[PDB]
Amino acid sequence: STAAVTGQTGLTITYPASATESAAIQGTFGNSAAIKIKNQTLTWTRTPEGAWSCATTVEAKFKPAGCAS
Amino acid sequence: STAAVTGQTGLTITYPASATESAAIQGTFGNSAAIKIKNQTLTWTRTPEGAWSCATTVEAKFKPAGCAS
Amino acid sequence: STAAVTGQTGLTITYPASATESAAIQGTFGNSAAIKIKNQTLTWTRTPEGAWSCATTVEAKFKPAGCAS
Amino acid sequence: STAAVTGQTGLTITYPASATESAAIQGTFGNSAAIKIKNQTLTWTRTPEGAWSCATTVEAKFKPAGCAS
Amino acid sequence: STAAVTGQTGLTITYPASATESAAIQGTFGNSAAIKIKNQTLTWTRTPEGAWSCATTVEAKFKPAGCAS
Amino acid sequence: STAAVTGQTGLTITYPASATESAAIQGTFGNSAAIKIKNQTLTWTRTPEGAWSCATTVEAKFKPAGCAS
Amino acid sequence: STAAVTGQTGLTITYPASATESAAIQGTFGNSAAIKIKNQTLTWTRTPEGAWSCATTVEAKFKPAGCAS
Amino acid sequence: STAAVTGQTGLTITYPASATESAAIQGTFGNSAAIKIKNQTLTWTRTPEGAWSCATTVEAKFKPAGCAS
Amino acid sequence: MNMYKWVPESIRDSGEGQPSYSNNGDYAPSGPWVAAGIHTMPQSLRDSMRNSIMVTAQARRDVIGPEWGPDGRFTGYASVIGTPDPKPADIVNKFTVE
Amino acid sequence: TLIELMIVVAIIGILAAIAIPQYQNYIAKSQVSRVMSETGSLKTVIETCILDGKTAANCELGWTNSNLLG
Amino acid sequence: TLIELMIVVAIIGILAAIAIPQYQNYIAKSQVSRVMSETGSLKTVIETCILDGKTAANCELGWTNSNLLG
Amino acid sequence: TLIELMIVVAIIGILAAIAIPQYQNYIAKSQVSRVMSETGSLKTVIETCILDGKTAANCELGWTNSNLLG
Amino acid sequence: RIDSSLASSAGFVVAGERWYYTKRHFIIPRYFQNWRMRRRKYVTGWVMP
């Protein structure tokens, strides 16, 4: 719906309030997700200069090569 | 095949002629479908805002996680 | 040899036509069967939900554990 | 074509007849436009002092940053 | 293995050289296939409109629901 | 490449010589283009008064709203 | 269980390190296998081009149809 | 980072210094790329006149139609 | 104008070809056959046969419109597009000794 | 094995149930923004027509018919 | 476990008969739409050349080769 | 019956011996298409730097490190 | 790729379609294909001496 508040409980949006702080698109698994990864967190962060990078707390078996960090 | 008159008798398309009505893609089982779910229907409905959702009339044990609603 | 008509008269197949009927595979003894069980029968019935069960009209001593009902 | 009459029915222009009236260019969506904005209008109004400002009836989320008036 | 000629003698593909001819992929049984179907063929037909169709020369009871036409 | 002669065979440029003849840009599909439209052409013509318009010989289902004239 | 080292002594994996090396998945029978095939070796070899092919050292009468040498 | 020095080792930029030399952007496959196409290079070259084109050292079946030699 | 021509020295032994392991263990023309790895056969023989194929393909005809193999067994594939370009004719000039 | 194929169906179940974001926002904004340019393009002609004193019928417009009537 | 295996065979036949929509509409339309971008980019050159008064031979065209020949 | 189980055995061997469609060709092409797209977007910045007159060290590149080594 | 049987059977034992390069293996270059034969679309002109 909006960046400030979303219509899903499992999705959170971090909006930058200044030019010297980063933005994050964090999502936590749940509902129909696998029980092993039921409570893992997955976020997409953006540096203030305009660089997007991907990271997650899931196990290295489950990590894609594009987010192996 | 067009949306107004589809090429299959089991596929029905609800075309919205205005900005306030919703579109629906209804698919009814039959022919090669299982006898238990022979006369059930599966539909894809789209809100005017652009949000798609799935509904099905089959039993819960046959409903996938996507169309459990 | 189809479900509608079998190769022999001693085998009968009850094929359901709707989602609420049950299948039945009934076989009546004869020909080379014993005189005691000359006119007995054994039937395999299938519930519409997908459960198979066995029923037999032979005496208790001739009933195995498989169709002991 | 001309300010009095144009080659398109969906575009009309309000040409002032004196020094105390304003100039406005109005265009209505449709045809190949999105159905959600089928009958919405966007206007460029010119103040009699010579200042131009843009306004439209399209929803806020679809409004460009330049016509957020 | 190219479309013009492949590494297997039992497989051939008709490539469309124009816009008014259909594409076809033909597979002839053999080698370790059953002797009763040692010379029957299964083919995939692609209409020039972009639609895929299937047909085969095997008997009805051996024919699954996937290529009933 | 010039207006009179171009470096590509599939591009044709009609340069007007008087105030009554219309300018035109002609392009023919091929090479890596789809086989269905392998020999179709799309053209942009410019009227003597200076109006640019587009037309194409592809099927209706291949024409976007831009050139579905 | 990783490719370089696994948790079972009867399974070995040959992992290519360059574009010209071929993968191999070899399994040696034993433990619960037949005494006649107590030390036979079963391997899957993968060409660098991406083609999987089968080879085994068991007798011909024990080779299945797919891997019938 | 910059044309002279970038943030990735596999990326090289050929920045022209005179009006009679070309510009090139070359990328080398590796890390998360396929082992088969490892160490190969794809380059985007620019003539001093202003025309761009693509080339690559991968196999033909891996070459996209827009980068075919 | 254009004509299709062979590309000499641009063909490599890629290795996507499997020599056939013989089940019979001898030179029997028939019998079941296997798909064996390319590394089994010597590299010298591979180079010799590749060189023979290259000679057969390129050296047999440099600039001609030959025939493409109906079963794919061509020996150097080239083509001529449109009307083939004719030799400016061989200018025979005759002088007879009286 | 009935487990590999069943897992495949679940994977097919997962892939088909992907969340599709509202692409209507992107399309509608592009149409309005493009129309914004066309309507703003005729400003130059209107200004001088007003400043030169030409009448509404005497002001010639170089407007062309477009797919979007806006 | 005889009846167990042909469940996969039924599943394999079910999945193999999956409907394939006509992707030719999508690819060709994208190819046709791309051609317009290549074709429409030359409108500026042609319009300037005509208004400049130069002839066909004097109109320099910055056309780059396209794999679609459009 | 003994015949029934060998029939299951024949089914298992047949199913497991399905031919691999050589997915290396599919995967490799997709990665190549990805790499040229990123360096393709790099054409915009380099072109203007040449047309502006800036030096190699003075040209700003908004490049992001790629897992495929670019 | 097509077919790479252009080479003869030098060093092979000929047994029908089988080119036995060894006592235990043979090849069928009609199917044994591992060469990517290349063809281009050249341009050429005629010069008279």
Author numbering:
A (entry chain CQ), B (entry chain CR), C (entry chain CU), D (entry chain CN), E (entry chain CS), F (entry chain CO), ...: 79 to 147
I (entry chain b): 1 to 98
J (entry chain BT), K (entry chain BU), L (entry chain BV): 9 to 78
M (entry chain b): 147 to 195
Task: Quote the study on this structure.
To investigate the recognition mechanism between AP205 and T4P, we employed single-particle cryo-EM to obtain a structure of the AP205/T4P complex. The two copies of Mat exhibit different conformations: One Mat (referred as outer Mat) extends further to elevate its apical domain away from the capsid shell while the other Mat (referred as inner Mat) is embedded deeper within the capsid and has a larger bending angle between the central and basal domains. Within the T4P-Mat complex, the apical domain of each Mat specifically plugs into the groove formed by three adjacent pilin subunits within the T4P (referred to as Pilins 1, 2). Notably, the C-terminal Ser147 of Pilins 1 and 2 are positioned near β3 and β7 of the Mat apical domain, respectively. Apparently, glycosylation at these two serines can prevent binding of AP205 Mat. It is likely that the substoichiometric glycosylation of pilins allows AP205 to bind to unglycosylated sites on the T4P. We also observed that the internal cleavage site of Pilin 3 at Ser79 is located at the binding interface for the apical domain. This cleavage allows Ser79 to move ~13 Å away from Gly78, allowing its interaction with β8 of the Mat. The Mat of AP205 has evolved to adapt to such a post-translational cleavage at the phage-pilus binding interface and may not be compatible with an uncleaved pilin anymore.
